[PDB]
Design a protein around this ligand. Sequence first.
Ligand SMILES: CCCCCCCCOCCOCCOCCOCCO
Length: 707
Amino acid sequence: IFVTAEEQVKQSLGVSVITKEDLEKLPVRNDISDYVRRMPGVNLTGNSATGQRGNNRQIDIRGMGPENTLILVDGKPINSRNSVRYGWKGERDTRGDSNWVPAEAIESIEVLRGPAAARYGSGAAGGVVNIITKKVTNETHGSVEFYTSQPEDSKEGSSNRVGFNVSGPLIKDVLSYRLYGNYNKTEADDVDINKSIGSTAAGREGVKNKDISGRLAWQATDQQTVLLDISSSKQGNIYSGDSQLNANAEADAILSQLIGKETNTMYRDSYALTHEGDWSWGKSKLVAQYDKTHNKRLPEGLAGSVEGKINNLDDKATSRLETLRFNGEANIPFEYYLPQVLTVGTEWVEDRFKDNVSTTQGKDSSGSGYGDQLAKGDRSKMESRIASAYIEDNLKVTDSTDVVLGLRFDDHSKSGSNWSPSLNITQKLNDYFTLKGGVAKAYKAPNMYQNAEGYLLSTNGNGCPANIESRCLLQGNGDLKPETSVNKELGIQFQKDIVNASLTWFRNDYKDKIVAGTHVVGTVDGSSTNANTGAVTNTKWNILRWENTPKALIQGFEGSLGLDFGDIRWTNNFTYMMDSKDKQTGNPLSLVPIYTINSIFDYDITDQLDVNFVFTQYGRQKSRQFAENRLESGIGSGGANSALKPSTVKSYSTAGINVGYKFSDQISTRVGVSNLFDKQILRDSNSISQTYNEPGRAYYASLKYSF
Ligand SMILES: CCCCCCCCOCCOCCOCCOCCO
């Protein structure tokens, strides 16, 4: 049977595929990023290379930053983090969107890196993580699973899960369901975990997850199928003391009270309806989906020494993000000169966003604050629309040569239209080798804060670019161009039986990335009235705006190695990172080790008994190297002492073992330990390299009923 372009590029070098089986052999604590991170060209890093909110690490692909990692679930985009205020330097106080589907509910995970991911449009310049959930089943198969992790160190949080999955027929062979549920609670790290090295940065914040999700599958005709997906999730945090400038939580009037409490809460509801036709001329797929996300959390400083810190014990505000999305698509096999499979498709997406707490700034009772002049109209509501169409061909150019030619057109309501060409070649050399490559141009539309004229922020001086003197404002920009990136990869794939290997060069030229601008587009006079006196004072502000900056360069090598001896097996990879630099600042896009080596080992001792070993090795993580504002350039209010202090985390390694006993056909269980050598790093507030907590030694166990 025929093979579409989409299917074919999942044979690309920059693609890997995790199974339910892998996931079982190496249990996750909560967030799957802890297993996804082990793939070639993948990292776990903060939202920006500044290090702020460093324990908020999420899936990074080839060092392009997590804003550039598009998470999908069964093919449908998640975008809940856009709820969260995106700040002056690219920071967001989110944990991201790789934690919406409980580990035990996952059938498969597809990681697409580089050229193979540009297909999927806005936000895929880094890559795509496609979480594939368990399927409907024509006989009732059940699962219940528990998990616990138990850190040696008293100050690190233990974690606990329970969850179920059940699927069956309601009507044999025409209507069937899948339903899965999960309650996870990972306790926070103590407030004071990082103190023993003079550091005021918080440890990891905890999370209570509540997830429920339902699928109905209906075979309406011999050639027509209808899927319904309804899911709802709630994520409530457990506050560990985090704050953008790493204040001393325990000695802060307010924060000290919020510890161990829920200060932010993330709600997500999602509905999708899908129709799939199986026609004589080929195949078709229509999708409607609607997503509703609320972001409820305590308010915060939005400038100065209080920036990024909680103002208040009580007055929670909520932000509301609705997405409606439609997708239609057809696959037709035909033969003109060569065998082909033409894909042709349409996509429509609209976003509506309410945010009334971030979109207030420079409002003054005189009616002449800086924002009263620059931002008029309802600043609280933002719209985005993308209309897209694409065409794709999978050609057998020879019985040895498989080639994919795609083109994608995108038209965004603010940024304009944009073309994304996409080549992808597979070329057998012989029974054992094969050559592979792709070139693709990825897209990303501005994020809503970056676009929005009603979003204003300020510094008194320190945040200003080193070449400006006093006070700067940063406004959103409706006239931004979209982010574009030409992503190339090329490599060799080897496979005898028992042995396989790849090596692949990758290189992305990332263009017009949207960031805090450095040119003053003009100036404005802003009145600031004294609350109690009515005394006015006018301030000349320099106006900066979000702006696309010309070029960043990413480059490196991925290799992988597989050694299968039946009962004994080894899966290893490495990734070497030759280049991560913006050609203007000289800084890296995203803090990631210069190299990362991974090894997984499996040995089935008996049919029941199993042992499993994991080892990971990280080369050196350098900090940002070059100043981009007054403070960093040694001319802020703190002078030369507050100047940038580049530093680099020294390389290191961690390991883990399991013994995995299947007590029965029905009952499984797995006991193990992680960071076997207690290689434990604490987050240093006085550094811009040591930005995160590497958890120490932890004993964990998981048992699974299967009925
Ligand atoms: C072609 C790229 C592949 C990169 C990995 C190559 C490494 C080859 O190792 C094969 C055997 O792996 C043994 C795994 O066990 C680790 C033993 O040392 C334990 C350290 O505490």
